[PDB]
Structures are given as structure tokens and as C-alpha cells.
Amino acid sequence: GSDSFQPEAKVRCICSSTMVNDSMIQCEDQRCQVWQHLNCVLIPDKPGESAEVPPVFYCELCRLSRAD
């Protein structure tokens, strides 16, 4: 919203919404600590199917820095 960005709990999703979506998830990087909407970062093999929810989730920052 304005100053609701905690150093350990910071919701940064592509939707720019720090609300309580279907399911939230925190980055697996202690140097990031960024929460994101699982549904937003979920890529199901099909539309309306079982999305792929991996054990370790890395935001865009970590994703690029990792080049995975």
C-alpha cells in the first residue's frame, strides 16, 4: 500500500497486489524474503488443471540471478 513492506515479509507480485490470494508463498532466498501469489507463479500443464507447485520458489530477482 505505502509502508506495508516489511524487511522479512514483503509481498511483491506481478499483479502489484499484496492481498491474500488463493495461496501465498515466500521466496527461498533469505536475501530476498519476498512473498508472491502461488497462483500467479503457478504454470499448470493445462487450463484449469493441477498447477505445478515446486518445493523451492524463487522470485524474478533470484530467478534471473540464478539463470535457472
Binding site for Zn ion (CB under 5 A): 13, 15, 27, 29, 32, 37, 40, 59, 61-62
**Cβ closer to Zn ion: 3 or 20?**
20
State the SS3 of the chain: CCCCCCCCCEECCCCCCCCCCCCEEECCCCCCCEEEECCCCCCCCCCCCCCCCCCCCCCHHHHHHHCC
**Cβ closer to Zn ion: 51 or 61?**
61
CB of 64 to Zn ion, least distance (A): 10
**Cβ closer to Zn ion: 29 or 51?**
29
Question: Which residue is at the shortest CB distance from Zn ion?
Answer: 32
